[PDB]
Design a protein around this ligand. Sequence first.
Ligand SMILES: CC(C)S(=O)(=O)NC[C@H](C)c1ccc(-c2ccc([C@@H](C)CNS(=O)(=O)C(C)C)cc2)cc1
Ligand SMILES: C=C(C)[C@H]1CN[C@H](C(=O)O)[C@H]1CC(=O)O
Ligand SMILES: C=C(C)[C@H]1CN[C@H](C(=O)O)[C@H]1CC(=O)O
Ligand SMILES: C=C(C)[C@H]1CN[C@H](C(=O)O)[C@H]1CC(=O)O
Ligand SMILES: C=C(C)[C@H]1CN[C@H](C(=O)O)[C@H]1CC(=O)O
Lengths: 85, 85, 32, 257, 51, 51, 51, 51, 51
Amino acid sequence: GPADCCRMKECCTDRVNECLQRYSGREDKFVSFCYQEATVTCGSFNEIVGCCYGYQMCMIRVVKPNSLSGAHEACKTVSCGNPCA
Amino acid sequence: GPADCCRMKECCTDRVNECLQRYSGREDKFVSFCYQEATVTCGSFNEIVGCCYGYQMCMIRVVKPNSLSGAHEACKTVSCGNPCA
Amino acid sequence: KTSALSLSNVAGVFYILVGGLGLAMLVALIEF
Amino acid sequence: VGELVYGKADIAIAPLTITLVREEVIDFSKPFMSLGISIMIKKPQKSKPGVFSFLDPLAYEIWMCIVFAYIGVSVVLFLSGRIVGGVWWFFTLIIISSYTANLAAFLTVERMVSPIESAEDLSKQTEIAYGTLDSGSTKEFFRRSKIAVFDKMWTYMRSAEPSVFVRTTAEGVARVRKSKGKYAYLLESTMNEYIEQRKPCDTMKVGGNLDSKGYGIATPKGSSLGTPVNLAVLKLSEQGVLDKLKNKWWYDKGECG
Amino acid sequence: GGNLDSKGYGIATPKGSSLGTPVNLAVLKLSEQGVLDKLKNKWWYDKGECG
Amino acid sequence: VGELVYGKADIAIAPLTITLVREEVIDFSKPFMSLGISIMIKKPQKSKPGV
Amino acid sequence: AFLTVERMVSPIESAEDLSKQTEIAYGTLDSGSTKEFFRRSKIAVFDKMWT
Amino acid sequence: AFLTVERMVSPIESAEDLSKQTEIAYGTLDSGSTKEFFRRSKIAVFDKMWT
Amino acid sequence: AFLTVERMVSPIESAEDLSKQTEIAYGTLDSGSTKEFFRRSKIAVFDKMWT
Ligand SMILES: CC(C)S(=O)(=O)NC[C@H](C)c1ccc(-c2ccc([C@@H](C)CNS(=O)(=O)C(C)C)cc2)cc1
Ligand SMILES: C=C(C)[C@H]1CN[C@H](C(=O)O)[C@H]1CC(=O)O
Ligand SMILES: C=C(C)[C@H]1CN[C@H](C(=O)O)[C@H]1CC(=O)O
Ligand SMILES: C=C(C)[C@H]1CN[C@H](C(=O)O)[C@H]1CC(=O)O
Ligand SMILES: C=C(C)[C@H]1CN[C@H](C(=O)O)[C@H]1CC(=O)O
């Protein structure tokens, strides 16, 4: 099927968030893991970059234990940057 | 400043549509011109591909003279494809 | 082209030439 | 293009390169002539032999020394001579062997090296500067190119100082002529061939083309002239009119042709 | 020797078909991107056994 | 080409040479490949060295 | 130097010579653009070849 | 000439040379960081090598 | 042959020779990681060099 970078983004944030939910309270540790899982599930134009890189970074620096919900709600609108390199 | 391909898409369709509105009855002819302008205004990850390619093709193949509104309303949700290639 | 001008290396053979001519002068002298 | 889109002209006939950006605004007839981005340099001087190239392998010092050694051996023989003849034989043996070997090295080195093959070689060396026109399809190609070699070349050209870009074709060619072969000019194969066939004929095209494209006759989108012009270009193509025309203007009356 | 004449292949579409212009622009894009070049090198030269 | 004119196929992608006779009935995309009529022969096994 | 070079060039008879000799026969496909090119060709050499 | 070939350099220079010739086959482990490096690499030479 | 190819000779005195000769003086920056490296080094040669 055809790829949609936008659909890729929305799916990315959703899957990352849904992933981090099982890791509640350890949330700040597993951001990159769940980002990997989300990159696998939602696909990526560049395997290194991932589905949404900017959201990944935002989450990584913002997310604190149990602070997940507010963090995701803040970071999901963030610009993903260039999904090329 | 990050581009965020999704916002790039919404902007792309918006600028294409707003441009094509200026040409009445010639809508099917100027699709590529207005797409050029939209790629210019909204920027592009790949200058060749443009902001959203799938929407461009969709419009080119669908749009008939005076059929603009319905055609665009049909084509704006379509997957853009690979933005880097 | 990388111009050589190898004179330094050949100078040694020039030296063994001069040595040979020197010994030659020696033999020529001891002969007479 | 502007004159065509805004309706100041009904048709455009010129060495206009077919590009996607232009194909979006205008309609291109099937290509009437073939071209590609190519490299033009100054042709190396054939021969400047002199009589000095024979004295090049053996140093001036070696000739002076072998003369004084010669007269030295003569005056030694004037004053037993067996070892003199032997030593002199060994001497002149090593010397003629050295001359033969050194000259062999000269000719081998001269036959071994080639200045330029392709564009990739241009990308791999900073010794010879190279450039394109200030504008047009070539510069845009280099800019818009995601291919490695071309990308690198573009980065170099834009970053390089002083500017490698020229305003006109004649200026670029003139720069190729004045630079003693230190400047390479990237231009479409057609112009390259044409300038190459014109006196002083000091310039030449090296390697293949970077890309393969063509010129075309342009007509406003939705114009009535388009299909007739296209079919006309096809007719001229099959009839061989285009070929004979090119040979007429390029090669046939070519002075160095 | 050289070539007798200079011509080309092409993708053919029915006159007045909706696919025509998209196909054309597609071929142009693939052309500038070097997709055509790389593909030709793929099938012709790369696996070429004669060196 | 026949399959195209009579509507048995939506598109034709093949080493189809562009000709005026064909260009009249159908539409050709810009050429995706360049070619020309050329001569093919048997390569000489050896080259006479000579005096 | 010559022996160190090891350069080998292979000459060609091109198109023009082919028209001038009956020793080497030559031909094309039973139909298609090449045969039609030779058929409708108004150029001297190609005309001779077609005949 | 022979001895000149003998002392002559450049049998192998870089990785790019492997990409430029099909005569010598080359490979990596069935898994591990190297294969993945070639796999995920978007830079030209290594990409070609991976293909 | 050897005149055509020439050659390159690369000398190495390495680190220890600096410890073994007073003829060539040697030094580091007034401060930084290098000086600290020589200072805190418990290895014989580097110790001597620092002294
Ligand atoms: C702009 C690109 C999409 S492209 O140039 O069309 N395609 C690239 C591809 C490598 C290519 C490039 C150039 C040509 C090409 C072939 C022939 C000619 C001239 C000599 C003859 N004109 S014609 O169109 O073939 C004729 C039959 C009327 C001019 C250009 C054929 C194919
Ligand atoms: C000669 C000029 C300025 C023109 C001709 N074709 C290219 C064009 O159609 O833009 C330009 C040159 C180039 O960009 O290589
Ligand atoms: C292979 C065949 C039969 C086709 C392919 N192109 C030419 C064409 O488009 O007519 C034909 C060859 C030829 O005419 O020699
Ligand atoms: C030895 C093996 C299988 C390991 C070691 N380092 C790489 C790694 O950590 O994946 C692997 C080697 C390789 O991928 O070439
Ligand atoms: C330039 C200076 C003083 C810095 C640079 N790197 C080393 C550093 O990061 O400390 C220092 C150099 C050195 O220690 O020889």
